[PDB]
Amino acid sequence: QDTFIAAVYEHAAILPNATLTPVSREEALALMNRNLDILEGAITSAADQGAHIIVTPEDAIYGWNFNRDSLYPYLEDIPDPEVNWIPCNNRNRFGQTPVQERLSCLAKNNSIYVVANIGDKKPCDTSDPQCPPDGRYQYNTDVVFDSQGKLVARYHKQNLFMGENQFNVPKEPEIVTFNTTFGSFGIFTCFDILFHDPAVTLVKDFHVDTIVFPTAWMNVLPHLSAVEFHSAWAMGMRVNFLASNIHYPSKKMTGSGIYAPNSSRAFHYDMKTEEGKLLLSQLDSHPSHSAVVNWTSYASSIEALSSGNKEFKGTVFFDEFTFVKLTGVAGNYTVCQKDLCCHLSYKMSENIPNEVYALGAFDGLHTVEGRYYLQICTLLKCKTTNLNTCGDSAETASTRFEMFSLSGTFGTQYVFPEVLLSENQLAPGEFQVSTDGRLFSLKPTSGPVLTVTLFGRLYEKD
Numbered sequence: 001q002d003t004f005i006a007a008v009y010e011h012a013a014i015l016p017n018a019t020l021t022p023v024s025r026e027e028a029l030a031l032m033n034r035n036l037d038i039l040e041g042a043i044t045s046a047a048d049q050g051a052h053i054i055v056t057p058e059d060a061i062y063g064w065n066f067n068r069d070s071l072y073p074y075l076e077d078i079p080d081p082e083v084n085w086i087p088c089n090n091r092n093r094f095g096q097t098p099v100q101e102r103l104s105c106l107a108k109n110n111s112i113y114v115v116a117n118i119g120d121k122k123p124c125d126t127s128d129p130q131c132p133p134d135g136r137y138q139y140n141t142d143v144v145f146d147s148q149g150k151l152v153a154r155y156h157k158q159n160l161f162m163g164e165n166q167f168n169v170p171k172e173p174e175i176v177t178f179n180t181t182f183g184s185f186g187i188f189t190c191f192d193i194l195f196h197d198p199a200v201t202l203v204k205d206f207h208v209d210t211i212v213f214p215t216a217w218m219n220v221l222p223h224l225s226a227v228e229f230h231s232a233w234a235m236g237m238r239v240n241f242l243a244s245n246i247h248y249p250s251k252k253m254t255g256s257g258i259y260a261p262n263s264s265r266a267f268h269y270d271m272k273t274e275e276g277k278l279l280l281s282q283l284d285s286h287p288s289h290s291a292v293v294n295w296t297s298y299a300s301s302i303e304a305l306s307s308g309n310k311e312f313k314g315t316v317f318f319d320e321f322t323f324v325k326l327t328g329v330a331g332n333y334t335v336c337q338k339d340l341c342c343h344l345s346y347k348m349s350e351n352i353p354n355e356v357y358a359l360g361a362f363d364g365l366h367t368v369e370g371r372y373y374l375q376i377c378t379l380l381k382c383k384t385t386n387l388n389t390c391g392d393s394a395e396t397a398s399t400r401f402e403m404f405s406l407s408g409t410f411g412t413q414y415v416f417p418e419v420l421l422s423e424n425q426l427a428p429g430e431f432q433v434s435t436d437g438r439l440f441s442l443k444p445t446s447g448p449v450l451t452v453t454l455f456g457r458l459y460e461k462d
């Protein structure tokens with residue numbers, strides 16, 4: 001089969017109450033089942049529209065407020081899928097596994113692949129020298145059930161966010177795929193998307209067609225809003241990408257979508273309501289990709305578009321960029337930091353007097369809430385008129401662009417092209433990436449621009 005219908009669900013989770021000691025197994029199961037009641041509504045609705053697969057979010061059934069002990073009662077022992085097991089048809093093969101059982105039956109009864117995120121426990125003895133003092137491993141765990149209810153994938157999250165003290169890191173990164181009649185699938189979770197293992201390996205070495213991606217992502221503008229970065233990673237890696245996110249505006253969680261190599265196909269962003277949201281779209285089972293992009297090609301072939309720049313320092317997500325202000329309604333600028341030079345040609349649709357845009361370059365190691373090496377060229381709207389706010393989180397803008405073209409001398413082939421419009425809207429079909437590494441407009445932007453950015457990772461320098 002050449003196409004399929006993908007579904008993702010953004011979930012307004014029912015969170016356990018704050019308490020002082022762990023709840024009982026029974027209480028934990030009752031809460032998880034309240035969340036599974038809502039997810040069932042989304043799963044059935046998707047199947048009722050012909051979806052072949054649905055993704056649900058990270059932490060969707062029990063939330064994220066835990067220590068090791070308060071989490072324990074929510075956990076089950078999830079077997080390796082090689083055991084060949086359909087929980088719905090063979091309950092009790094592995095003791096008490098009611099969550100796995102209900103997920104299996106949801107997939108089977110609605111004849112749909114179901115991707116979900118739950119918690120694994122693996123009891124161990126002191127005979128095992130890595131066994132934690134308290135007698136078990138606890139893992140953040142994606143599970144996939146096929147349309148017969150069979151367990152076909154289990155993935156323990158490799159790259160834990162700071163504050164995920166309730167979980168362990170696996171001994172070695174787990175490279176997890178599953179094959180279907182509508183393509184080869186890979187899987188990883190939230191923060192994993194910023195790292196090499198397993199995310200990059202799945203694409204490079206295992207040639208997956210599609211990624212399924214449960215997440216509970218906290219939006220950080222200008223470069224790491226969920227719909228923005230997730231759609232860019234898909235475009236840069238040339239895969240289909242099903243992003244299912246938590247809905248919790250209180251912690252800046254919102255941003256789900258279905259992304260293809262050429263463009264976003266559907267997205268949802270909502271900071272105002274507490275509603276969940278189901279998105280569907282057709283995708284190609286084996287997406288065609290253009291020619292491989294050389295990200296330094298055009299940029300290394302030209303001379304600086306400007307010189308005698310008035311340059312200044314600005315902070316973007318704790319990293320010190322080198323910026324130059326855009327003075328004209330139209331222009332051509334070049335700005336550099338260390339090994340990276342960034343080039344921008346642009347024309348605004350009109351100059352908004354009290355609105356300032358800057359071009360920035362960064363080439364260095366990020367360290368706050370994670371350690372990773374970045375190379376970034378960014379056009380962005382500065383939060384205020386003051387240049388000290390270029391790089392700050394900016395939600396809205398009024399300046400539309402008639403044209404833009406951005407490029408840089410990247411020392412990596414892993415670069416993710418981002419375009420975000422005012423109110424955190426994507427710009428599907430409005431831009432393109434050339435083989436020589438230019439990100440450029442195909443027409444005037446449909447709304448005002450917050451950023452156009454080339455976000456690059458040098459995994460070897462982490």
Ligand SMILES: *[C@@H]1O[C@H](CO)[C@@H](O[C@H]2O[C@H](CO)[C@@H](O)[C@H](O)[C@H]2NC(C)=O)[C@H](O)[C@H]1NC(C)=O
Binds near residue numbers: 332347403
């Ligand atoms: C410098 O920027 C200008 C725009 O401010 C670039 O010219 C553009 O304008 C034309 C209007 O008809 C477009 O048709 C051109 O395609 C467009 N240029 C590009 C490269 O897209 C100008 O070329 C820039 N200078 C360069 C790239 O050297």
Ligand SMILES: *[C@@H]1O[C@H](CO)[C@@H](O)[C@H](O)[C@H]1NC(C)=O
Binds near residue numbers: 031
């Ligand atoms: C939290 O407490 C409120 C108020 O008693 C109750 O209505 C709700 O069901 C509780 N949630 C859980 C998970 O116990």
Ligand SMILES: *[C@@H]1O[C@H](CO)[C@@H](O)[C@H](O)[C@H]1NC(C)=O
Binds near residue numbers: 102105106109
């Ligand atoms: C699966 O289908 C049968 C319908 O008779 C029912 O016994 C079972 O409860 C269903 N489970 C789910 C989760 O839909």
Ligand SMILES: *[C@@H]1O[C@H](CO)[C@@H](O)[C@H](O)[C@H]1NC(C)=O
Binds near residue numbers: 296301
């Ligand atoms: C990319 O282009 C640059 C300069 O145009 C060239 O030096 C380099 O060899 C190219 N690399 C690849 C992988 O094509």
